[model samples]
Target: ESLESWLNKATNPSNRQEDWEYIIGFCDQINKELEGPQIAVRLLAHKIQSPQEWEALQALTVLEACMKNCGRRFHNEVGKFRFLNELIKVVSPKYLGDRVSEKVKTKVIELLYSWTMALPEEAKIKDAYHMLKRQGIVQSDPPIPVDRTLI
Candidate 1:
């Protein structure tokens, strides 16, 4: 099924719970077909919303599933620095505090930290840290010193 159809089902509360399993299953299948998780990210992005309620929740759910089951693929597909920025915006404490359960919030943070740690250098973590700080998720911006050896 198309992302639009899956999104439509995901928005309806009654259908969402039932459809969520199927939607995620479909994403997993597509991940296999495409040999990557870009399609999954594109599919989940359809469900993200700045003002909507259920759509936002569904988007997070999809994100969690993608991060959990397709870690390597996700790292490959979501590599662009901007993708990390968007994710921080979505799960920022101010944005999802009321909507997301505490458990999910912790899980999201853990996943984000893990993803950051998997990066080859400290620059990606520094970027993510700065983004989070700008969004009020972190206390301050930590320095990301460049290796002078490379200079």
Candidate 2:
């Protein structure tokens, strides 16, 4: 609320730039402290409708930073909830049946890929992984054996 209040008070480009810079600076800290990462996700869940260009871009910028620092937070509880699907939506190029800029999709994919790789093997094969594959959110690259077994 405090950050949002400060952001709300940013009446013009001059003050808004100040608030944006401040928020950007603290993003690493926000996602690093205990409970702080969840707070970032909570706010990320607050979906926007027809947002202004600045707000939308800034929101994605801060969001990417949060994902950068506290990926474990997201892979834990947040992934256990509905927000995981929301994240899939963000990364799915087929959401538009085409493609999105690689920057956004690449960051999200890297985070999910890193988390999935870091998890226990059983947990790694669970629903989200399958879902991501089905939706074409994450590509699968299983190794193919070249030789045949002798009888």
Candidate 3:
């Protein structure tokens, strides 16, 4: 299936329930395809900006799952300025921050910080998180439980 098509289904809020079936399947599919990380991040970047908080939150969940399953290639895409800027836009007051729900902003920060800890080699991820901290957007590193630190 096309990446867009698959992502639409995976992140459809109406389809979400107590299970993470489609979300996890989305990650598995990305792992199976060679250019998956690049394509998925672009599509996810768009979805993450959805005006509807539910959809945007689901998009973030998919992003977090991909980070755990898709390995370094996926990490490289997210750690880059292009993708990191998109995430920053969601939290930066000059951008969508005022409009975006606090829930989404918090998750975005937590994910960025988690990546900084889990993938220290991805310097740009740390830089992005640090920028948020310095801007006062993120007051501190959002704490994650030990088991939830990484995959």
Listed per model in order, the count of residue pairs whose N, CA or C atoms clash below 3 Å is 0, 0, 0
* Model 1 alpha-carbon miss at residue 21, Å: 2.3
Clashing pairs for predicted structure model 2, backbone only: none
Estimate the TM-score of every prediction.
Answer: 0.58, 0.50, 0.92
Q: Could you give me the TM-score of model 2 versus the true structure?
A: 0.50
- A best-first ranking of the candidates according to their lDDT comes to 3, 1, 2
- Kindly indicate the candidate among 1 and 3 with the higher TM-score: 3
Best model per TM-score: 3
Whole-model lDDT per candidate? 0.56, 0.49, 0.85
Give the true-structure RMSD of model 1: 8.1
Q: Which residues of candidate 3, in runs, are more than 4 Å off?
A: 16-19, 148-151
Which prediction has the highest lDDT against the true structure? Answer: 3
Candidate scoring better on TM-score of 1 and 2: 1
Question: Can you give the lDDT of residue 63 in candidate 3?
Answer: 90
Q: What is the TM-score ranking, best to worst?
A: 3, 1, 2
lDDT tens readout by residue for model 3, 37-136: 8999999999898898888988998898888888888999998989999999999989999999999999898888888878889899888888899999
Instruction: State the lDDT at 144 in candidate 2.
Output: 28
- Candidate 3 matches the true fold with a TM-score of 0.92
